[PDB]
């Protein structure tokens, strides 16, 4: 009842019952807070002020003090910087355009007669305004403030914006009314109850909370807010942005005066952590909050995405009890104590993860699970990892009901139910499936969907990082949903057919190997592995071996991501789960070998020479496994791949050696022999073993390419292309070693290579190779070096390449229609013309103004072809007067300046 609010105002308004000087009013408006007003509170806290206004002797009185109806105009007769901004927006006209070289304050008044016989179914006069022509001359401050209040209740957003704007102003009368002591004693109580607000709000309705913070921007003394209260606010509030701002202004404006900064820094970091911007956090720690050499050094390898030694560097620091000061700070320790955890989380290092997530819990070597409830710090910090790790171990088929124990113990409680039903309904659902329960899993997942929708839909649109970070989980929830559905329906357990179909969906529905991060891969992979173990139990071609086929393949696709994303350390773990297991099927073994070798290769970039050679030496020993030769003699695809890797292996070595040719000496002598041995140039000259190696390499490659050219013509292309390219890549570096070198001993060896490469790339380019298309200009400079016997081959070949592959490089192509190598391109360029005239034309123009032909049949042929192109563009010659038309826009005096230069 609005009368009751007013009746309650009857003495809250009263001059002794809330003060009647508006500063002391404001101090006592901070008495008004009770938690059962939040959404509303500001909108009422404000309106009180806008009664105290009323008894100002000008509140009842005009704002404008001349008749706005008269006496006024405006002019923009200026070349201001705001004119540039206005003509950027949309330009206004100008028009001087000259072809050569009645009272004041008065209105042309009506002349009623119409000088027509109208459309159908006298003299000048001057007047001044009717009172209906022009608006209110002179409104009073009264009518400004008055209408707002009733709507300021209803849109708190203006209320927020309003309050701060009052409040901020209200301070800044200063010394002309209030002295140092008074202002500052007041700020202490302001600050104190600003803390009280944040201490007491339990809903955290963000417009209120944000406003207290947005107020805190405005004046220096306000900045000493409880850092943990700010974060505790912001986290529940989704108000991290203002949380950060507050802290950053605190850190700077409190700069000149270190202990509370240290606290602030941790909180600042925690805000960023909750929105996914860890790169900033690295900056905080590396360059202010970390002190020790170890701290950077861990982050460094971690930033390079090798958590393994980073984890151990943290562990080493954590368990180091002695130091050059005895005193890495309470915070740097707190940081390591977290940092180390993520390492394990990415490393899938679940055993150390459950162990470390609990080991620092208060000597619970007898494992109390429930101590977490003692601190929201613990409930936030360790809990997620612990749930995760235990559950991953359970899904890897381990056994310990201590999780369901601790969870069912938690289910007895209120928060110890509710926060799980909110934040972990995924895991709750999975645990019900782990206990064979369809319904309760179906509930907790049904809930999970809704939970996500609100979770995501509450994140700000500008929090792109976190929006994104939420999102991938959807797949897991959906797969849980599909799987639940599939197993809920009895017709799926009768026939192998709908199951064979199911796996095809899961193969087709992977995560992204270059953007989805590894932990997220881990999840779907593990989860499917478990779901298939459940189907495997429901039933038991043999679906079981088909399921292992999937399991294996999936491990591969996962391993592949951890290569492409250089989580090589994780790929070691995964490899060693399969290292012997794969050695069972046939194809499977082959796949394992290949994968291992690829990984060895990727690892073999990041490295020094001996280290690289060592990193690949071992692969030779798998590649010279040849019980597999029976399968390779049957499976050309793999055989090609085998040779590819094999040649690549030698290439790596040969490059490593040739960069630093004596470095063979750095490797332990047995292996230094293994090298010289298996190069086979035991003449024992590194240069000769390198030429030998390269030759040996080329054998595998050339064969691989041949095997690739054979029985591979579908009306899989990746490997075909890959071969052709790979060979070419090698040949190019060699051709460059020749081009780089004045002394050329590698002459008989590098004979085939120029002619050879062509036939590969122009095969590859027919296969739509984007990378060949990116490299293509190479050919155009190679033929110039190798004009003897490139040209013929290239020419009889190149017709077979789609014209629209070339378009990128058109400039080059048209820029050599005058040189004899024109012979290769002339057909091609004409075809491009004959499809895409609007493409070629500008390149052609600029080149047409630039040739000079030879006065010989070769240059005549070219000049005559060019005349045929030129003429076969001059139908568009009609349009391209457009060029001349654009040309008019240049300043003629500038063109004269250029010409006269």
């Amino acid at each position: 009842n609005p009368g009751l609010q007013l009746i309650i105002r009857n003495f809250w308004s009263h001059e002794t019952r809330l003060p009647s000087n508006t500063l002391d009013r404001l101090l006592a408006l901070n008495s008004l807070y009770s938690p059962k007003i939040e959404v509303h509170f500001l909108s009422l806290a404000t309106n009180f002020l806008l009664e105290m206004t009323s008894m100002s002797p000008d509140y009842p009185n005009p704002m404008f003090e001349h008749p706005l109806s008269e006496c006024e105009f405006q002019e923009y007769t200026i070349d201001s910087d705001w004119r540039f901004r206005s003509t950027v927006l949309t330009p206004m006209f100008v028009e001087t355009q000259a072809s050569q070289g009645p009272v004041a304050g008065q209105i042309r008044a009506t002349q009623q007669q119409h000088d027509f016989t109208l459309t159908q179914t006298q003299v000048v006069l001057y007047r001044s305004y009717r009172h209906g022509d022009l608006p209110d001359i002179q409104i009073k401050h009264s009518s400004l403030i008055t209408p707002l209040q009733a709507v300021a209740q209803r849109d708190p957003i203006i209320a927020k914006q309003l309050f701060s704007s009052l409040f901020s102003g209200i301070l800044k009368e200063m010394d002309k009314f209030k002295t140092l002591s008074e202002k500052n004693n007041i700020t202490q109580k302001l600050l104190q109850d600003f803390n009280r607000f944040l201490n007491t709000t339990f809903s955290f309705f963000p417009p209120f909370v944000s406003c207290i913070q947005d107020i805190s921007c405005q004046h220096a003394a306000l900045l000493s807010l409880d850092p943990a209260a700010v974060s505790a606010g912001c986290l529940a509030s989704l108000q991290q942005p203002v949380g950060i701002r507050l802290l950053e202004e605190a850190l700077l404006r409190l700069l000149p005066a270190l202990p509370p900064d240290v606290l602030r820094w941790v909180e600042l970091a925690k805000l960023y952590r909750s929105i996914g911007e860890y790169d900033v956090l690295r900056g905080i720690f590396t360059s202010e909050i970390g002190t020790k050499q170890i701290t950077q050094s861990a982050l460094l390898a971690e930033a390079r995405s090798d958590y393994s030694e980073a984890a151990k560097q943290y562990d080493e620091a954590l368990n180091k009890q002695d130091w050059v000061d005895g005193e890495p700070t309470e915070a740097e320790k707190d940081f390591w104590e977290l940092a180390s955890l993520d390492c394990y989380n990415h490393l899938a290092e679940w055993k150390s993860l459950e162990y470390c997530s609990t080991a620092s819990i208060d000597s619970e070597n007898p494992p109390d699970l429930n101590k977490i409830w003692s601190e929201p710090f613990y409930q936030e910090t360790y809990l997620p990892y612990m749930i995760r790790s235990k559950l991953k171990l359970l899904l890897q088929g381990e056994a310990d009901q201590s999780l369901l124990t601790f969870i069912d113990k938690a289910m007895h409680g209120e928060l110890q139910k509710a926060i799980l039903e909110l934040h972990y309904s995924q895991e709750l659902s999975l645990l019900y499936l782990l206990q064979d329960d369809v319904d309760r899993a179906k509930y907790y997942i049904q809930n999970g969907i809704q939970s996500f929708m609100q979770n995501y839909s509450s994140i700000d649109v500008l929090l792109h990082q976190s929006r994104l970070t939420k999102l991938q989980s959807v797949q897991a929830l959906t797969e849980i949903q599909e799987f639940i559905s599939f197993i809920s329906k009895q017709g799926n357990l009768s026939s192998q057919v709908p199951l064979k179909r199911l796996l095809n969906t899961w193969t087709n529905r992977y995560p992204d190997a270059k953007m989805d991060p590894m932990n997220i891969w881990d999840d779907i992979i593990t989860n499917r592995c478990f779901f298939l173990s459940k189907i495997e139990e429901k039933l038991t071609e043999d679906i079981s071996s088909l399921i292992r086929s999937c399991k294996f393949s999936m491990k591969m696709k996962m391993i592949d991501s951890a290569r492409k994303q250089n989580n090589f350390s994780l790929a070691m773990k995964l490899l060693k789960e399969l290292h012997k297991e794969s050695k069972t099927r046939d194809d499977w073994l082959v796949s394992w070998v290949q994968s291992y070798c690829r990984l060895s290769h990727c690892r073999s970039r990041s490295q020094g020479c001996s280290e690289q050679v060592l990193t690949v030496l071992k692969t030779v020993s798998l590649l010279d496994e040849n019980n597999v030769s029976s399968y390779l003699s049957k499976n050309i695809l793999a055989f090609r791949d085998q040779n590819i890797l094999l040649g690549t292996t030698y290439r790596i070595i040969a490059n490593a050696l040739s960069s630093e040719p004596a470095c063979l000496a750095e490797i332990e002598e047995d292996k230094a022999r293994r090298i010289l041995e298996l190069s086979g140039s035991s003449s024992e000259d590194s240069e000769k073993v390198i030429a030998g190696l390269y030759q040996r390499a080329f054998q595998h490659l050339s064969e691989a390419v041949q095997a690739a050219e054979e029985e591979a013509q579908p009306p899989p292309a990746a490997g075909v292309i890959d071969a052709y390219m790979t060979l070419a890549d090698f040949c190019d570096q060699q051709l460059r070693k020749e081009e780089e070198n004045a002394s050329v001993i590698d002459s008989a060896e590098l004979q085939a290579y120029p002619a050879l490469v062509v036939e590969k790339m122009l095969k590859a380019l027919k296969l739509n190779s984007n990378e060949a298309r990116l490299k293509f200009p190479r050919l155009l400079q190679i033929i110039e070096r190798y004009p003897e016997e490139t040209l013929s081959l290239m020419t009889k070949e190149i017709s077979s390449v789609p014209c629209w592959q070339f378009i990128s490089w058109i400039s080059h192509m048209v820029a050599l229609l005058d040189k004899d190598q024109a012979v290769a391109v002339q057909h091609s360029v004409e075809e491009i013309t004959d499809n895409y005239p609007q493409a070629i034309v500008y390149p052609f123009i600029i080149s047409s103004e630039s040739y000079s032909f030879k006065d010989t049949s070769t240059g005549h042929k070219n000049k005559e072809f060019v005349a045929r192109i030129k003429s076969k563009l001059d139908q568009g010659g009609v349009i391209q007067d457009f060029i001349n038309a654009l040309d008019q826009l240049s300043n003629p005096e500038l063109l004269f300046k250029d010409w006269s230069n």
Binding site: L68, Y76, P135, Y456
Partner: protein, 872 residues
């Protein structure tokens, strides 16, 4: 009681077997006995015993169950006539357009039962005919497409055609891409059809037709899906206020995302996912709407993480995120609070972008009615500060930024459906105009801002009510923009008049139809307040005229159903209505604004204009042509000689020769546009045949006037050289394309597409336009004979006229093989009555016998129709 219903099906089943035991006669009879019966269930009532009720009986009859054992395919031969009769019944139905872009069915019965055929056939169709359905799929869909042309604003056809396509998906008829590939080509070229027709459409029409596209088979939709990108984008962007439309988009995106080639789709997804942001944007403080909010997530997951990440790409942000950036970089609206003793200060700038949002939107009545007072009073404060011209050295600061982001608000709030708020703001906007128009020099940024806001309203695609209201503001603008200036300055430079017309012109030259249409409405709404100062019509009027000609020409490519044609007619007509009078003034050579493209000159007069109009005579843009004819006749008699057109022409033909005029009835258009060259069109087909066809029509329509008015003499008109069109283009057409469908051109000229087969959306325009051109020939050729006793002696050198006579016997013996295919007696039943007129000029021409050589020398027989008597 219910169980007796099976006995009723047994009764009405048995009596259909009885009839079929006649043998061969039956089909027609039963096929039309069911028909007068269906006319009841489909005229049986419903509101927005029913369209639902009889359905099961009909299903049990159109299902070949063992009711005979206890002839089977004849339960389906009954369903066969549920095509045969039912689509032959499109020929039953007639409906066209009588009681700003809405229309009404002239004959309600031919809709009001017929859409309960739709809603009853919404089960009476969807069975696969037990796979017997073959003969219907091609023929049915063909028929219904060819006639769906009759009526836009009909949902029902697209519904039934979509039921056709969905059933055809389960029957997989298009699998592997001859009836199959014929229909395949039809629907593929229908991908250039309703998907292009999109940009006009409106609620249920748009919903029922989107339903159709999105239900099309993926095997088609592997081609150039830029067609359907907007369609699916529309589907989601709309379906949020017709919830089960979005459900079709689920069906489609699902069906696609498996049966489509993933590499084909991988690039495109970027444009689709963003529109699903909104479907998850709030907790809100046919199947149920939160089934949908659920289903999008189920899709996003099943669609897979690989593609999903497209949702959160920066390009998903822009067209919201403009609502999160500052309106001015200063903090503008500085205000001092009256507390009792002392004064704090506020910068109200920051309220405006929220207060506006509410004042436009806020659903609470009691909020909204107060909110407007906020904004109304706050607007005043701006004007206050704009006139807080200080006694200090600082000028009153800029406001353009605010004004721009403010004044469009006010116009929405003025055309606002609420009486009470409108009753405040509708006055307000007038006072604003009245104030703002008071400036003295050329580009007041404020004035510009206001104007541009008004125009940005008058082009608005959706809102005729705004375009209406804005029309008033425009009028009142210009009225007031007269109201505030001295004659001697207005004569020197009519500043805002210039700064208006220039922007009107650009909107008249914009290629988008709505970007033109608004400017014609503005031009109407000022006409009655233009033509008041002498200066205005003295300076602007030719420029104004000429520009509207071009804006008419640009309308040529559009639908007529925007009404731009008519709007432009009035825009030009009212110029004619001015020029009736003030040619008296314009005859003087005086300084004027040079119309777009004239040779620059020291001064201009009505001669220069009418000579330019002459240059426009033979141009292909139809209504431009009709105007330039009519206007030229209205403009000869008022140059300083005031002579007739014939006697005026006598001078320039004596000076320039018929050469000059032919070089404008055929050389007619831009610079030297060379339409005299018939040859390249008789050489080089592409649908640019229609461009030639138009050019021939314009050449003819030129001759279709000036001999007929007898304004140039016939043996002049058919000049002794260079008149290529009549001599070849006509003759050829009659010899070589007239007897034939499109493929006689689309053989030897360029090529005809694919295997020589393409859509009625092409073919109807070809044959329609083709069947126009013959008319204009005949009218023209008659007009030779009926002005000259000699004209037949120059066309006699085209002695091989006789092709035209086989055309003429066709034109009466079955012209439906040529023109009655349109369906509109409005054109298509004057054309025979017009044809027959020419035959007097044949009967009383010496050529008479050759009509007998087409008919009475071959075909005349007396009794054969009495022979057919027992058959009739």
């Amino acid at each position: 009681s219910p169980k007796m219903q099976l006995v009723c099906c047994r009764a009405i089943v048995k009596v259909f077997l009885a009839l079929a035991a006649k043998g061969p006669v039956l089909r027609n009879c039963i096929s039309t006995v069911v028909h007068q019966g269906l006319i009841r269930i489909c005229s049986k009532p419903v509101v927005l015993p029913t369209y639902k009720d009889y359905v099961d009986l009909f299903r049990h009859l159109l299902s070949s169950d063992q009711m005979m054992d206890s002839s089977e395919s004849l339960n389906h031969l009954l369903y066969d006539e549920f095509v045969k009769s039912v689509l032959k019944i499109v020929e039953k139905l007639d409906l066209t357009l009588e009681i700003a872009a809405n229309l009404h069915p002239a004959k309600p019965k031919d809709f009001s039962a017929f859409i309960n055929l739709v809603e009853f056939c919404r089960e009476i169709l969807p069975e696969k005919q037990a796979e017997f359905f073959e003969p219907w799929v091609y023929s049915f869909s063909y028929e219904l497409i060819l006639q769906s042309t009759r009526l836009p604003l009909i949902s029902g056809f697209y519904k039934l055609l979509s039921i056709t396509v969905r059933n055809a998906k389960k029957i997989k008829y298009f699998e592997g891409v001859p009836e199959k590939y014929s229909c395949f080509a039809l629907f593929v070229k229908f991908g250039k059809e309703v998907a292009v027709k999109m940009k006009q459409y409106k609620d249920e029409l748009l919903a029922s037709c989107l339903t159709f596209l999105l239900s099309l088979p993926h095997n088609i939709i592997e081609l150039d899906v830029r067609a359907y990108v907007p369609a699916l984008q529309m589907a989601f962007k709309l379906g949020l206020s017709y919830t089960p439309l979005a459900e079709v988009g689920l069906n489609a995106l699902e069906e696609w995302s498996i049966y489509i080639d993933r590499h084909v789709m991988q690039p495109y997804y970027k444009d689709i996912l963003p529109c699903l942001d909104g479907y998850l944007k709030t907790s809100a403080l046919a199947i149920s709407l939160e089934e949908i909010r659920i289903r999008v997530v189920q899709m996003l997951g099943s669609l897979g993480g690989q593609i999903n990440k497209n949702l959160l790409t920066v390009t998903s942000s822009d067209e919201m995120m403009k609502s999160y950036v500052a309106w001015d970089r200063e903090k503008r609206l500085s205000f001092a609070v009256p507390f009792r003793e002392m004064k704090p200060v506020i910068f109200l700038d920051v309220f405006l972008p929220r207060v506006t949002e509410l004042a436009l939107t806020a659903s609470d009545r009691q909020t909204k009615v107060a909110a407007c007072e906020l904004l109304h009073s706050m607007v005043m404060f701006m004007l206050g500060k704009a006139t807080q011209m200080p006694e200090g050295g600082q000028g009153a600061p800029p406001m353009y930024q605010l004004y721009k982001r403010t004044f469009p608000v006010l116009l929405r709030l003025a055309c606002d459906v609420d009486q009470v708020t409108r009753q405040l703001y509708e006055p307000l906007v007038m006072q604003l105009i009245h104030w703002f128009t008071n400036n003295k020099k050329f580009e007041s940024q404020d004035t510009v801002a206001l104007l541009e806001a008004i125009l940005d309203g008058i082009v608005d695609p959706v809102d005729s009510t705004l375009r209406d209201f804005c029309g008033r503001c425009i009028r009142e603008f210009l009225k007031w923009s007269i109201k505030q200036i001295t004659p001697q300055q207005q004569e020197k430079s009519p500043v805002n008049t210039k700064s208006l017309f220039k922007r009107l012109y650009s909107l008249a030259l914009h290629p988008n139809a709505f970007k033109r249409l608004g400017a014609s409405l503005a031009f109407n709404n000022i006409y009655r307040e233009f033509r008041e100062e002498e200066s205005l019509v003295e300076q602007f009027v030719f420029e104004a005229l000429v520009i509207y000609m071009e804006s008419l020409a640009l309308a040529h490519a559009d639908e007529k159903s925007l009404g731009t044609i008519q709007q432009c007619c009035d825009a030009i007509d009212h110029l004619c209505r001015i020029i009736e009078k003030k040619h008296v003034s314009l005859n003087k050579a005086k300084k004027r604004r040079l119309p777009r493209g004239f040779p620059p000159s020291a001064s201009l007069c009505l001669l220069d204009l009418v000579k330019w109009l002459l240059a426009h005579c033979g141009r292909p843009q139809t209504e431009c042509r009709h105007k330039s004819i009519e206007l030229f006749y209205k403009f000869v008699p008022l140059l300083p000689g005031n002579r007739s057109p014939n006697l005026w022409l006598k001078d320039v033909l004596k000076e320039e020769g018929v050469s000059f005029l032919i070089n404008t009835f055929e050389g007619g258009g831009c610079g030297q546009p060379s339409g005299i060259l018939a040859q390249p069109t008789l050489l080089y087909s592409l649908q640019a045949t229609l461009c030639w066809l138009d050019l021939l029509l314009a050449a003819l329509e030129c001759y279709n006037t000036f001999i007929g008015e007898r304004t140039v003499g016939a043996l002049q008109v058919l000049g002794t050289e260079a008149q290529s069109s009549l001599l070849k283009a006509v003759a050829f057409f009659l010899e070589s394309i007239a007897m034939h469908d499109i493929i006689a051109a689309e053989k030897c000229f360029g090529t005809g597409a694919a295997g020589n087969r393409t859509s009625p959306q092409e073919g109807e325009r070809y044959n329609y336009s083709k069947c126009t051109v013959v008319v204009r020939i005949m009218e023209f050729t008659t007009t030779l004979l009926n002005t000259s006793p000699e004209g037949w002696k120059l066309l006699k050198k085209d002695l091989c006229n006789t092709h035209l006579m086989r055309v003429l016997v066709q034109t009466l013996c079955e012209p439906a093989s040529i023109g009655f295919n349109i369906g509109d007696v409005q054109v298509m039943a004057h054309l025979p009555d017009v044809c027959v007129n020419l035959m007097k000029a044949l009967k009383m021409s010496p050529y008479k016998d050759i009509l007998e050589t087409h008919l009475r020398e071959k075909i005349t027989a007396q009794s054969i129709e009495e022979l057919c008597a027992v058959n009739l």
